[PDB]
Design a protein around this ligand. Structure first.
Ligand SMILES: CN(C)c1cc[n+](Cc2ccc(CCCCc3ccc(C[n+]4ccc(N(C)c5ccc(Cl)cc5)cc4)cc3)cc2)cc1
Ligand SMILES: CN(C)c1cc[n+](Cc2ccc(CCCCc3ccc(C[n+]4ccc(N(C)c5ccc(Cl)cc5)cc4)cc3)cc2)cc1
Ligand SMILES: CN(C)c1cc[n+](Cc2ccccc2)cc1
Ligand SMILES: CN(C)c1cc[n+](Cc2ccccc2)cc1
Lengths: 353, 353
């Protein structure tokens, strides 16, 4: 049990005491329990709980998660509150300028290897389809994807690195002519139909909870979390981006702190399994269509998601170059950027585009 | 049909086109309809609609309300979104830095005289009880009431008026010794039990919709709106404050632009009718209690709400003095302050406290 700094213990006690009902309201400071889940400079996480010897008075939680930040603020808070109301995310117990109190969900995150398990993959698809089907009070013009890529590309072309290895690696990445490549990708995707839906935009193992005590259950053992990058976007991006994440393991404990394997991208068989679960969850009379109409829809979706996978590589590659310059957290960002652009051209070669 | 300024028409068209689905997404500027509901400097309201000749494609609204503002921002937006999810307020279609798009609810506001109609009063009580019963992710310590009164009192004692009539009226209002009176009220209310619940804090005719087409229905013909001043607070304040509003008509078309009548405060008979509807809506097996246990609960509530009514007068009286100094909107603020403090001492005399 890693203990927080004294100032954080006191602040956490006050937020719990004032925002949570029942036994919390009368809790003494010397009875308050708190431990660090993740520290750092931003998005710090703590578990806060009542003493085992304190009974609950009503329906109040015995344990909660405190998230510290360390208008995007408004949109994020409204999104979280709405997903909570709809039973699609952890409940929201308290909101304040410095952070929030959320329902504690006993669980662990998935590992990269688990993404390919057929039952896990089927559930991710069903969960993503459920999120895609819902209405949210946000801008419905799908400007996010190329808007973000253009903004990031402009930043990348203004970066002045001082460190030798980053200078060299940047020269190589820019040698591809990224403006031209971006507008060729824009052209390709302009001609690729894909419905605009509420997308997670970051569906990978770190953002998927395996619910404790349900590990052996057939269905409903996962929860998608961490929707902070969500927006209306092309459905093909959310699915394609997820598929790309099959290739990257971020648990590697030595530099560059990730492993990449092109061979771990889902095979067409595995892609079909995923979309066969997605479709009936997104369009509820889907199974009643003829085997042949279902087959055509699946074929057209395979093309769509694999083209949109190219934008996942391009977007994350640009993001990673910017991180190499601006981040305060250690990671092989330039090497990761190169891995994404290698995958981009590999995928392009395979697609013949 | 009062038309908005050209800049507002264009901004409204863009927000509707980008935030609303279906036929909105492809709407041409020359087909956009908008009219002013209320103008001003802040909280401006517009009705926006599709042409009568444009069919809806799905479930999109044909008409919406645009609210312009002209962190409190975060709390207000989360509250509105949650009440919408729970079917307790207008739906939320879009949120952006300058305002929001809300469901249009065909209706009119109630008039002051309508507050005393037995069926109307019964429904207000049931509606207030429903709001009081719910959980919200906001601070549960009831610091709002006296916190706001202390803050406002400090401001009032620093006001330097230049206009003769305001100087004279202020001297009279301060002659009561407001610090002493406030702390005597604090003492009285400290000894008056009242559960802390999610309160509207402004339940009067201007914030209650009479739903069009339900005017002749027995029940469910109202909607409480405009929760921007809501907070956890003593239940007695929300009820007592509502009762005080029976006395004030803000529709008077000459200076001071309100009428006050002490005789229009609900009689004990009328108060009992209100609380007899509130109680079974707030505690759902209430009717199964003995006639005698119900009677005692009602008696104790009558005492509670009438004591808390004193804080409604004191709070609004202070608010009104501050408005006389800072407001950009014409109203008899000093005369209204005097009316609230007259009612305060009148109520004190009747209560013998
Ligand atoms: C490298 N990569 C994908 C990883 C690496 C590692 N991990 C697990 C892990 C391992 C080690 C660390 C310590 C190093 C910190 C790296 C890091 C900090 C912050 C984020 C948040 N983030 C989410 C979505 C996002 N999008 C959707 C986006 C928006 C705009 C563009 Cl342009 C592109 C993309 C942008 C940013 C992610 C990773 C942290 C976490 C998961 C994924
Ligand atoms: C005078 N009175 C009650 C009225 C007068 C008139 N109307 C209808 C009406 C008629 C004419 C006008 C034009 C003049 C504008 C007066 C005005 C501007 C803004 C508000 C909003 N407001 C809501 C709750 C609130 N609380 C809960 C609060 C918080 C902190 C303290 Cl300290 C005290 C109290 C504080 C402020 C209300 C009235 C507008 C509206 C209803 C009620
Ligand atoms: C030029 N300076 C001070 C820095 C430049 C880049 N970083 C981020 C970083 C750190 C370790 C590995 C990868 C990226 C930190 C400081
Ligand atoms: C000293 N000055 C410029 C002002 C002082 C007070 N107000 C508000 C007001 C206006 C009309 C009636 C009541 C209150 C506006 C200007």
């Amino acid at each position: 049990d890693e203990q927080p700094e004294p100032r954080t213990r006191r602040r956490a006690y006050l937020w719990c005491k004032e925002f949570l009902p029942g036994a919390w309201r009368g809790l003494r400071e010397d009875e308050f329990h708190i431990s660090v889940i993740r520290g750092g400079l931003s998005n710090m996480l703590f578990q806060c709980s009542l003493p085992d010897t304190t009974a609950t008075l009503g329906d109040e939680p015995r344990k909660v998660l405190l998230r510290l930040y360390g208008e995007a603020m408004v949109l994020e808070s409204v999104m979280f509150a709405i997903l909570a109301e709809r039973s699609l995310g952890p409940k929201l117990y308290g909101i304040f300028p410095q952070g929030r109190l959320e329902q504690f969900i006993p669980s662990r995150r998935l590992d990269t290897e688990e993404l390919s398990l057929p039952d896990i993959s089927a559930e991710i698809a069903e969960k993503m389809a459920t999120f895609h089907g819902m209405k949210m009070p946000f801008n419905k013009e799908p400007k996010w994807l190329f808007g973000t890529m253009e903004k990031y590309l402009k930043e990348v072309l203004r970066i002045k690195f001082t460190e030798e290895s980053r200078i060299k690696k940047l020269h190589k990445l820019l040698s591809y002519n990224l403006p031209l490549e971006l507008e060729n990708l824009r052209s390709l995707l302009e001609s690729t139909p894909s419905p605009v839906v509420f997308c997670h935009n970051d569906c990978q193992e770190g953002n998927i909870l395996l619910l404790e005590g349900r590990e052996n259950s057939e269905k409903q053992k996962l929860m998608l979390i961490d929707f902070e990058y969500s927006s209306y976007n092309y459905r093909g991006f959310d699915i394609g981006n997820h598929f790309c994440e099959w290739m990257y393991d971020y648990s590697y404990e030595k530099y560059p702190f990730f492993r990449a394997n092109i061979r771990k991208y889902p095979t067409k068989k595995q892609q079909l399994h995923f979309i066969s679960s997605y479709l009936p969850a997104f369009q509820n009379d889907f199974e009643n269509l003829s085997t042949e109409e279902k087959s055509i829809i699946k074929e057209e979706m395979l093309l769509e998601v694999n083209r949109f996978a190219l934008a996942s590589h391009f977007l994350w590659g640009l993001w990673s170059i910017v991180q190499a310059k601006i981040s305060s957290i250690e990671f092989g960002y330039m090497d990761y950027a190169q891995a994404r652009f290698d995958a981009y051209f590999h995928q392009k070669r395979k697609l013949g585009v």
